[PDB]
Ligand binder design. Structure first.
Ligand SMILES: N[C@@H](CCC(=O)N[C@@H](CS)C(=O)NCC(=O)O)C(=O)O
Ligand SMILES: N[C@@H](CCC(=O)N[C@@H](CS)C(=O)NCC(=O)O)C(=O)O
Lengths: 208, 208
Protein backbone atom coordinates (compact mmCIF):
# COMPACT_ATOMS: atom_id res chain seq x y z
CA UNK A 1 0.00 0.00 0.00
CA UNK A 2 -1.23 2.67 -0.28
CA UNK A 3 -3.81 1.12 -2.62
CA UNK A 4 -5.60 3.00 -5.39
CA UNK A 5 -8.33 1.60 -7.63
CA UNK A 6 -8.66 3.45 -10.95
CA UNK A 7 -11.92 2.49 -12.62
CA UNK A 8 -15.20 3.57 -14.19
CA UNK A 9 -18.06 4.31 -11.75
CA UNK A 10 -19.45 0.76 -11.69
CA UNK A 11 -18.92 -2.45 -9.69
CA UNK A 12 -17.97 -4.50 -12.75
CA UNK A 13 -14.59 -6.21 -12.58
CA UNK A 14 -13.60 -4.38 -9.38
CA UNK A 15 -16.42 -5.63 -7.17
CA UNK A 16 -14.58 -8.75 -5.98
CA UNK A 17 -11.27 -7.03 -5.23
CA UNK A 18 -13.15 -4.30 -3.35
CA UNK A 19 -14.98 -6.92 -1.28
CA UNK A 20 -11.60 -8.46 -0.54
CA UNK A 21 -10.06 -5.16 0.60
CA UNK A 22 -13.09 -4.24 2.72
CA UNK A 23 -13.38 -7.66 4.36
CA UNK A 24 -9.63 -7.65 5.06
CA UNK A 25 -9.86 -4.30 6.83
CA UNK A 26 -7.73 -2.55 4.21
CA UNK A 27 -7.95 1.12 3.27
CA UNK A 28 -7.85 2.29 -0.33
CA UNK A 29 -8.55 5.22 -2.63
CA UNK A 30 -11.05 5.15 -5.48
CA UNK A 31 -10.03 7.18 -8.52
CA UNK A 32 -13.17 7.37 -10.62
CA UNK A 33 -12.78 7.68 -14.38
CA UNK A 34 -15.78 9.21 -16.13
CA UNK A 35 -16.80 8.18 -19.64
CA UNK A 36 -15.87 11.70 -20.74
CA UNK A 37 -12.33 11.44 -19.35
CA UNK A 38 -11.95 8.02 -20.96
CA UNK A 39 -13.04 9.36 -24.36
CA UNK A 40 -10.35 12.02 -23.98
CA UNK A 41 -7.88 9.24 -24.76
CA UNK A 42 -4.74 10.04 -22.75
CA UNK A 43 -5.44 7.71 -19.83
CA UNK A 44 -6.48 4.84 -22.12
CA UNK A 45 -3.31 5.20 -24.19
CA UNK A 46 -1.23 4.98 -21.00
CA UNK A 47 -2.90 1.76 -19.83
CA UNK A 48 -0.90 -1.38 -20.66
CA UNK A 49 -3.79 -3.14 -22.41
CA UNK A 50 -5.77 0.03 -23.04
CA UNK A 51 -8.30 -0.87 -20.36
CA UNK A 52 -9.29 -0.49 -16.72
CA UNK A 53 -9.05 -1.40 -13.90
CA UNK A 54 -5.63 0.07 -13.20
CA UNK A 55 -4.32 -0.62 -9.69
CA UNK A 56 -1.61 1.24 -7.80
CA UNK A 57 0.11 -0.33 -4.80
CA UNK A 58 2.78 2.03 -3.56
CA UNK A 59 5.10 2.43 -6.53
CA UNK A 60 3.78 -0.70 -8.26
CA UNK A 61 1.24 -0.26 -11.06
CA UNK A 62 -0.85 -3.24 -12.15
CA UNK A 63 -3.55 -3.95 -14.73
CA UNK A 64 -5.88 -6.97 -15.14
CA UNK A 65 -8.57 -7.66 -12.53
CA UNK A 66 -7.39 -11.20 -11.81
CA UNK A 67 -3.80 -10.00 -11.47
CA UNK A 68 -4.98 -7.55 -8.81
CA UNK A 69 -6.87 -10.37 -7.05
CA UNK A 70 -3.85 -12.67 -7.13
CA UNK A 71 -1.55 -9.86 -5.95
CA UNK A 72 -3.74 -9.06 -2.96
CA UNK A 73 -4.18 -12.77 -2.30
CA UNK A 74 -0.44 -13.39 -2.40
CA UNK A 75 0.52 -10.39 -0.25
CA UNK A 76 -2.32 -10.72 2.30
CA UNK A 77 -2.16 -14.49 2.71
CA UNK A 78 -5.36 -15.41 0.88
CA UNK A 79 -3.85 -17.92 -1.54
CA UNK A 80 -4.01 -21.31 0.17
CA UNK A 81 -1.88 -22.78 2.95
CA UNK A 82 0.47 -24.61 0.55
CA UNK A 83 1.26 -25.09 -3.14
CA UNK A 84 -1.48 -27.69 -3.60
CA UNK A 85 -4.18 -25.40 -2.19
CA UNK A 86 -2.77 -22.54 -4.27
CA UNK A 87 -3.39 -24.62 -7.41
CA UNK A 88 -6.94 -25.39 -6.30
CA UNK A 89 -7.53 -21.68 -5.68
CA UNK A 90 -6.39 -20.98 -9.26
CA UNK A 91 -8.64 -23.74 -10.57
CA UNK A 92 -11.63 -22.12 -8.89
CA UNK A 93 -10.79 -18.60 -10.03
CA UNK A 94 -10.24 -19.68 -13.62
CA UNK A 95 -13.68 -21.28 -13.49
CA UNK A 96 -15.17 -18.06 -12.12
CA UNK A 97 -13.48 -16.07 -14.90
CA UNK A 98 -14.87 -18.45 -17.54
CA UNK A 99 -18.46 -18.01 -16.35
CA UNK A 100 -17.97 -14.26 -15.94
CA UNK A 101 -16.89 -14.09 -19.60
CA UNK A 102 -20.05 -15.98 -20.62
CA UNK A 103 -22.10 -13.55 -18.52
CA UNK A 104 -20.31 -10.62 -20.15
CA UNK A 105 -20.99 -12.03 -23.61
CA UNK A 106 -24.69 -12.29 -22.76
CA UNK A 107 -25.34 -8.77 -21.48
CA UNK A 108 -23.17 -7.10 -24.13
CA UNK A 109 -23.89 -9.07 -27.31
CA UNK A 110 -27.19 -10.96 -26.99
CA UNK A 111 -29.00 -10.12 -23.76
CA UNK A 112 -32.72 -9.91 -24.44
CA UNK A 113 -32.57 -12.70 -27.02
CA UNK A 114 -30.17 -15.00 -25.18
CA UNK A 115 -31.25 -14.40 -21.59
CA UNK A 116 -33.68 -17.34 -21.50
CA UNK A 117 -31.25 -19.93 -22.87
CA UNK A 118 -28.51 -18.65 -20.56
CA UNK A 119 -30.65 -19.03 -17.43
CA UNK A 120 -31.63 -22.55 -18.52
CA UNK A 121 -27.94 -23.46 -18.83
CA UNK A 122 -27.01 -21.72 -15.57
CA UNK A 123 -27.54 -24.74 -13.27
CA UNK A 124 -24.92 -26.69 -15.19
CA UNK A 125 -22.53 -23.74 -14.90
CA UNK A 126 -22.99 -23.48 -11.13
CA UNK A 127 -22.78 -27.21 -10.33
CA UNK A 128 -18.96 -27.30 -10.43
CA UNK A 129 -18.74 -24.83 -7.54
CA UNK A 130 -21.36 -26.74 -5.55
CA UNK A 131 -19.31 -29.89 -6.15
CA UNK A 132 -16.08 -28.24 -4.98
CA UNK A 133 -17.88 -27.12 -1.83
CA UNK A 134 -19.22 -30.63 -1.20
CA UNK A 135 -15.69 -32.02 -1.41
CA UNK A 136 -14.25 -29.57 1.13
CA UNK A 137 -15.34 -30.13 4.74
CA UNK A 138 -18.93 -30.56 3.57
CA UNK A 139 -18.87 -27.03 2.18
CA UNK A 140 -19.10 -25.54 5.67
CA UNK A 141 -15.93 -23.48 5.27
CA UNK A 142 -14.50 -21.89 2.12
CA UNK A 143 -14.17 -22.84 -1.54
CA UNK A 144 -10.64 -24.18 -0.94
CA UNK A 145 -9.23 -25.31 2.39
CA UNK A 146 -10.23 -23.90 5.77
CA UNK A 147 -9.14 -20.31 5.14
CA UNK A 148 -10.57 -17.65 2.83
CA UNK A 149 -8.86 -16.98 -0.51
CA UNK A 150 -9.15 -14.36 -3.25
CA UNK A 151 -11.19 -16.94 -5.17
CA UNK A 152 -13.89 -16.82 -2.48
CA UNK A 153 -14.44 -13.12 -3.10
CA UNK A 154 -14.47 -13.55 -6.87
CA UNK A 155 -16.90 -16.48 -6.67
CA UNK A 156 -19.10 -14.57 -4.21
CA UNK A 157 -19.29 -11.64 -6.62
CA UNK A 158 -20.24 -13.90 -9.53
CA UNK A 159 -22.93 -15.62 -7.46
CA UNK A 160 -24.41 -12.30 -6.32
CA UNK A 161 -24.42 -11.13 -9.94
CA UNK A 162 -26.37 -14.20 -11.02
CA UNK A 163 -28.90 -13.91 -8.19
CA UNK A 164 -29.80 -10.55 -9.72
CA UNK A 165 -29.96 -12.00 -13.23
CA UNK A 166 -31.96 -15.02 -12.12
CA UNK A 167 -33.45 -14.68 -8.61
CA UNK A 168 -33.40 -17.96 -6.70
CA UNK A 169 -30.87 -19.60 -9.02
CA UNK A 170 -29.03 -20.75 -5.90
CA UNK A 171 -32.08 -22.42 -4.33
CA UNK A 172 -31.15 -25.66 -6.10
CA UNK A 173 -27.67 -25.54 -4.56
CA UNK A 174 -27.78 -25.82 -0.73
CA UNK A 175 -24.01 -25.54 -0.25
CA UNK A 176 -23.60 -22.48 -2.49
CA UNK A 177 -26.65 -20.87 -0.84
CA UNK A 178 -25.34 -21.29 2.70
CA UNK A 179 -21.86 -20.30 1.51
CA UNK A 180 -23.15 -16.99 0.13
CA UNK A 181 -25.12 -16.23 3.27
CA UNK A 182 -22.11 -17.11 5.40
CA UNK A 183 -19.61 -14.93 3.51
CA UNK A 184 -22.13 -12.10 3.23
CA UNK A 185 -22.49 -12.21 7.02
CA UNK A 186 -18.81 -11.57 7.73
CA UNK A 187 -18.92 -8.25 9.69
CA UNK A 188 -16.67 -6.03 7.57
CA UNK A 189 -17.99 -7.48 4.29
CA UNK A 190 -21.60 -7.22 5.47
CA UNK A 191 -21.06 -3.54 6.25
CA UNK A 192 -19.46 -2.92 2.85
CA UNK A 193 -22.19 -4.69 0.88
CA UNK A 194 -24.83 -2.59 2.63
CA UNK A 195 -23.06 0.75 2.13
CA UNK A 196 -23.94 3.34 -0.58
CA UNK A 197 -20.40 2.81 -1.87
CA UNK A 198 -21.51 -0.61 -3.11
CA UNK A 199 -25.29 -0.37 -3.32
CA UNK A 200 -25.51 2.87 -5.33
CA UNK A 201 -22.90 1.81 -7.87
CA UNK A 202 -24.29 0.30 -11.08
CA UNK A 203 -23.48 -3.38 -11.69
CA UNK A 204 -21.94 -3.15 -15.17
CA UNK A 205 -20.47 -0.50 -17.47
CA UNK A 206 -23.38 -1.33 -19.76
CA UNK A 207 -25.39 0.90 -17.41
CA UNK A 208 -23.14 3.82 -18.38
CA UNK B 1 5.09 -35.80 -10.72
CA UNK B 2 4.47 -38.11 -12.46
CA UNK B 3 2.75 -35.74 -14.88
CA UNK B 4 -0.07 -36.74 -17.23
CA UNK B 5 -1.70 -34.51 -19.84
CA UNK B 6 -5.21 -35.62 -20.80
CA UNK B 7 -6.29 -33.83 -23.95
CA UNK B 8 -7.60 -34.03 -27.50
CA UNK B 9 -5.00 -34.71 -30.23
CA UNK B 10 -4.18 -31.05 -30.91
CA UNK B 11 -1.76 -28.40 -29.60
CA UNK B 12 -4.52 -26.01 -28.56
CA UNK B 13 -4.48 -24.96 -24.92
CA UNK B 14 -1.79 -27.50 -24.02
CA UNK B 15 0.93 -26.22 -26.34
CA UNK B 16 2.40 -23.73 -23.85
CA UNK B 17 2.43 -26.09 -20.87
CA UNK B 18 4.06 -28.76 -23.06
CA UNK B 19 6.74 -26.31 -24.17
CA UNK B 20 7.31 -25.54 -20.50
CA UNK B 21 7.69 -29.20 -19.52
CA UNK B 22 9.97 -29.96 -22.47
CA UNK B 23 12.19 -26.91 -21.97
CA UNK B 24 12.41 -27.68 -18.24
CA UNK B 25 13.62 -31.21 -18.93
CA UNK B 26 10.52 -32.79 -17.42
CA UNK B 27 9.01 -36.14 -18.41
CA UNK B 28 5.28 -36.62 -18.85
CA UNK B 29 2.62 -38.90 -20.29
CA UNK B 30 0.15 -37.88 -22.97
CA UNK B 31 -3.28 -39.46 -22.62
CA UNK B 32 -4.98 -38.71 -25.92
CA UNK B 33 -8.76 -38.38 -25.93
CA UNK B 34 -10.38 -39.03 -29.31
CA UNK B 35 -13.51 -37.21 -30.42
CA UNK B 36 -15.29 -40.57 -30.27
CA UNK B 37 -14.32 -41.18 -26.64
CA UNK B 38 -15.37 -37.64 -25.77
CA UNK B 39 -18.78 -38.12 -27.38
CA UNK B 40 -19.18 -41.23 -25.22
CA UNK B 41 -19.78 -38.80 -22.35
CA UNK B 42 -18.33 -40.48 -19.25
CA UNK B 43 -15.00 -38.64 -19.24
CA UNK B 44 -16.63 -35.27 -19.92
CA UNK B 45 -19.10 -35.77 -17.07
CA UNK B 46 -16.20 -36.50 -14.70
CA UNK B 47 -14.30 -33.32 -15.63
CA UNK B 48 -14.84 -30.47 -13.15
CA UNK B 49 -15.92 -27.95 -15.80
CA UNK B 50 -16.83 -30.56 -18.40
CA UNK B 51 -13.75 -29.76 -20.47
CA UNK B 52 -10.12 -30.63 -21.18
CA UNK B 53 -7.24 -30.32 -20.52
CA UNK B 54 -7.22 -32.45 -17.39
CA UNK B 55 -3.82 -32.66 -15.67
CA UNK B 56 -2.60 -35.27 -13.21
CA UNK B 57 0.39 -34.60 -10.97
CA UNK B 58 0.89 -37.57 -8.70
CA UNK B 59 -2.37 -37.81 -6.76
CA UNK B 60 -3.39 -34.23 -7.61
CA UNK B 61 -5.88 -33.70 -10.43
CA UNK B 62 -6.21 -30.26 -12.00
CA UNK B 63 -8.30 -28.63 -14.72
CA UNK B 64 -7.92 -25.23 -16.47
CA UNK B 65 -4.93 -24.60 -18.75
CA UNK B 66 -3.77 -21.51 -16.87
CA UNK B 67 -4.08 -23.34 -13.55
CA UNK B 68 -1.73 -26.00 -14.93
CA UNK B 69 0.70 -23.29 -16.09
CA UNK B 70 0.62 -21.56 -12.70
CA UNK B 71 1.04 -24.89 -10.89
CA UNK B 72 4.10 -25.84 -12.92
CA UNK B 73 5.40 -22.29 -12.59
CA UNK B 74 4.97 -22.31 -8.82
CA UNK B 75 6.46 -25.78 -8.27
CA UNK B 76 9.35 -25.45 -10.75
CA UNK B 77 10.37 -21.90 -9.86
CA UNK B 78 9.08 -20.18 -13.00
CA UNK B 79 6.93 -17.59 -11.22
CA UNK B 80 9.19 -14.60 -10.55
CA UNK B 81 11.95 -14.04 -8.01
CA UNK B 82 9.67 -12.21 -5.56
CA UNK B 83 6.03 -11.19 -5.01
CA UNK B 84 6.33 -8.12 -7.23
CA UNK B 85 7.65 -10.13 -10.19
CA UNK B 86 4.96 -12.75 -9.53
CA UNK B 87 2.31 -10.04 -10.01
CA UNK B 88 3.95 -8.89 -13.24
CA UNK B 89 4.00 -12.50 -14.46
CA UNK B 90 0.25 -12.71 -13.79
CA UNK B 91 -0.30 -9.39 -15.58
CA UNK B 92 1.42 -10.77 -18.67
CA UNK B 93 -0.38 -14.11 -18.61
CA UNK B 94 -3.77 -12.48 -18.17
CA UNK B 95 -2.98 -10.37 -21.22
CA UNK B 96 -2.00 -13.48 -23.18
CA UNK B 97 -5.26 -15.18 -22.14
CA UNK B 98 -7.28 -12.14 -23.27
CA UNK B 99 -5.77 -12.18 -26.76
CA UNK B 100 -6.06 -15.96 -26.96
CA UNK B 101 -9.79 -15.63 -26.25
CA UNK B 102 -10.10 -13.07 -29.06
CA UNK B 103 -8.22 -15.45 -31.36
CA UNK B 104 -10.51 -18.30 -30.31
CA UNK B 105 -13.57 -16.16 -31.00
CA UNK B 106 -12.27 -15.43 -34.50
CA UNK B 107 -11.53 -18.96 -35.70
CA UNK B 108 -14.65 -20.46 -34.12
CA UNK B 109 -17.35 -17.84 -34.71
CA UNK B 110 -16.34 -15.50 -37.55
CA UNK B 111 -13.10 -16.60 -39.20
CA UNK B 112 -13.36 -16.03 -42.95
CA UNK B 113 -15.45 -12.88 -42.48
CA UNK B 114 -13.54 -11.41 -39.53
CA UNK B 115 -9.99 -12.47 -40.41
CA UNK B 116 -9.13 -9.22 -42.21
CA UNK B 117 -10.32 -6.89 -39.45
CA UNK B 118 -8.60 -9.03 -36.82
CA UNK B 119 -5.22 -8.87 -38.58
CA UNK B 120 -5.59 -5.10 -38.96
CA UNK B 121 -6.17 -4.80 -35.21
CA UNK B 122 -3.37 -7.25 -34.35
CA UNK B 123 -0.56 -4.66 -34.10
CA UNK B 124 -2.42 -2.88 -31.32
CA UNK B 125 -2.90 -6.20 -29.52
CA UNK B 126 0.80 -7.06 -29.72
CA UNK B 127 2.18 -3.65 -28.73
CA UNK B 128 1.65 -4.20 -24.99
CA UNK B 129 4.04 -7.16 -24.99
CA UNK B 130 6.62 -5.24 -27.02
CA UNK B 131 6.30 -2.44 -24.47
CA UNK B 132 6.80 -4.81 -21.52
CA UNK B 133 9.90 -6.17 -23.23
CA UNK B 134 11.27 -2.66 -23.82
CA UNK B 135 10.88 -1.88 -20.11
CA UNK B 136 12.79 -4.98 -18.95
CA UNK B 137 16.54 -4.91 -19.62
CA UNK B 138 15.89 -3.67 -23.14
CA UNK B 139 13.93 -6.83 -23.87
CA UNK B 140 17.13 -8.88 -24.09
CA UNK B 141 16.01 -11.34 -21.41
CA UNK B 142 12.50 -12.54 -20.59
CA UNK B 143 9.03 -11.00 -20.39
CA UNK B 144 9.43 -10.42 -16.64
CA UNK B 145 12.71 -10.21 -14.75
CA UNK B 146 15.90 -12.02 -15.72
CA UNK B 147 14.56 -15.56 -15.39
CA UNK B 148 12.02 -17.46 -17.49
CA UNK B 149 8.43 -17.77 -16.23
CA UNK B 150 5.35 -19.74 -17.24
CA UNK B 151 4.14 -16.55 -18.91
CA UNK B 152 7.06 -16.69 -21.35
CA UNK B 153 5.91 -20.06 -22.64
CA UNK B 154 2.29 -18.94 -22.92
CA UNK B 155 3.26 -15.72 -24.72
CA UNK B 156 5.61 -17.64 -27.02
CA UNK B 157 2.78 -19.99 -27.97
CA UNK B 158 0.43 -17.11 -28.70
CA UNK B 159 3.05 -15.37 -30.83
CA UNK B 160 3.79 -18.53 -32.83
CA UNK B 161 0.05 -18.99 -33.36
CA UNK B 162 -0.26 -15.48 -34.78
CA UNK B 163 2.76 -15.86 -37.06
CA UNK B 164 0.80 -18.65 -38.73
CA UNK B 165 -2.38 -16.58 -38.89
CA UNK B 166 -0.55 -13.51 -40.18
CA UNK B 167 3.01 -14.24 -41.40
CA UNK B 168 5.43 -11.44 -40.57
CA UNK B 169 3.13 -9.87 -37.97
CA UNK B 170 6.17 -9.64 -35.69
CA UNK B 171 8.34 -7.80 -38.22
CA UNK B 172 7.06 -4.48 -36.86
CA UNK B 173 8.12 -5.49 -33.35
CA UNK B 174 11.92 -5.91 -33.06
CA UNK B 175 11.91 -6.93 -29.39
CA UNK B 176 9.16 -9.54 -29.76
CA UNK B 177 10.86 -10.87 -32.91
CA UNK B 178 14.24 -11.36 -31.24
CA UNK B 179 12.49 -12.70 -28.14
CA UNK B 180 10.73 -15.42 -30.15
CA UNK B 181 13.92 -16.40 -31.96
CA UNK B 182 15.80 -16.46 -28.66
CA UNK B 183 13.30 -18.64 -26.79
CA UNK B 184 12.84 -20.90 -29.82
CA UNK B 185 16.61 -21.43 -29.83
CA UNK B 186 16.77 -22.82 -26.28
CA UNK B 187 18.14 -26.39 -26.86
CA UNK B 188 15.42 -28.51 -25.26
CA UNK B 189 12.61 -26.28 -26.55
CA UNK B 190 14.16 -26.13 -30.04
CA UNK B 191 14.24 -29.93 -30.15
CA UNK B 192 10.62 -30.17 -28.98
CA UNK B 193 9.31 -27.62 -31.48
CA UNK B 194 10.98 -29.53 -34.32
CA UNK B 195 9.72 -32.96 -33.25
CA UNK B 196 6.75 -34.80 -34.85
CA UNK B 197 5.14 -34.67 -31.41
CA UNK B 198 4.65 -30.93 -31.94
CA UNK B 199 4.84 -30.49 -35.71
CA UNK B 200 2.36 -33.20 -36.71
CA UNK B 201 -0.26 -32.16 -34.18
CA UNK B 202 -2.98 -29.85 -35.52
CA UNK B 203 -3.06 -26.33 -34.07
CA UNK B 204 -6.69 -26.16 -32.92
CA UNK B 205 -9.56 -28.55 -32.18
CA UNK B 206 -11.31 -26.82 -35.05
CA UNK B 207 -9.16 -29.07 -37.24
CA UNK B 208 -10.86 -32.10 -35.68
N1 LIG C 1 -9.00 -8.86 -18.84
C1 LIG C 1 -9.24 -7.50 -18.31
C2 LIG C 1 -10.50 -6.92 -18.95
C3 LIG C 1 -10.65 -5.41 -18.75
C4 LIG C 1 -11.90 -4.81 -19.38
O1 LIG C 1 -12.72 -5.52 -20.01
N2 LIG C 1 -12.04 -3.50 -19.21
C5 LIG C 1 -13.18 -2.75 -19.74
C6 LIG C 1 -14.18 -2.45 -18.60
S1 LIG C 1 -14.81 -3.97 -17.78
C7 LIG C 1 -12.69 -1.43 -20.35
O2 LIG C 1 -11.78 -0.79 -19.82
N3 LIG C 1 -13.31 -1.06 -21.48
C8 LIG C 1 -12.96 0.17 -22.18
C9 LIG C 1 -12.12 0.00 -23.42
O3 LIG C 1 -12.01 -1.14 -23.92
O4 LIG C 1 -11.56 1.02 -23.89
C10 LIG C 1 -9.41 -7.57 -16.78
O5 LIG C 1 -9.82 -8.63 -16.27
O6 LIG C 1 -9.13 -6.55 -16.10
N1 LIG D 1 -10.93 -22.21 -19.45
C1 LIG D 1 -10.57 -23.57 -19.93
C2 LIG D 1 -11.13 -23.79 -21.33
C3 LIG D 1 -11.14 -25.26 -21.76
C4 LIG D 1 -11.69 -25.50 -23.15
O1 LIG D 1 -12.10 -24.57 -23.87
N2 LIG D 1 -11.70 -26.78 -23.53
C5 LIG D 1 -12.19 -27.23 -24.83
C6 LIG D 1 -10.99 -27.51 -25.76
S1 LIG D 1 -9.78 -26.13 -25.85
C7 LIG D 1 -13.02 -28.50 -24.65
O2 LIG D 1 -12.70 -29.35 -23.80
N3 LIG D 1 -14.08 -28.62 -25.45
C8 LIG D 1 -14.97 -29.77 -25.40
C9 LIG D 1 -16.27 -29.55 -24.67
O3 LIG D 1 -16.48 -28.43 -24.15
O4 LIG D 1 -17.09 -30.50 -24.62
C10 LIG D 1 -9.04 -23.72 -19.94
O5 LIG D 1 -8.34 -22.70 -20.09
O6 LIG D 1 -8.55 -24.87 -19.82
Amino acid sequence: PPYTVVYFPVRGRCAALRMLLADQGQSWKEEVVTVETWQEGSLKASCLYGQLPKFQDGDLTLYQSNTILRHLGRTLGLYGKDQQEAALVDMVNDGVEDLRCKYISLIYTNYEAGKDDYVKALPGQLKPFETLLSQNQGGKTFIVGDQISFADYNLLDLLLIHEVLAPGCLDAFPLLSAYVGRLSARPKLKAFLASPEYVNLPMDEKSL
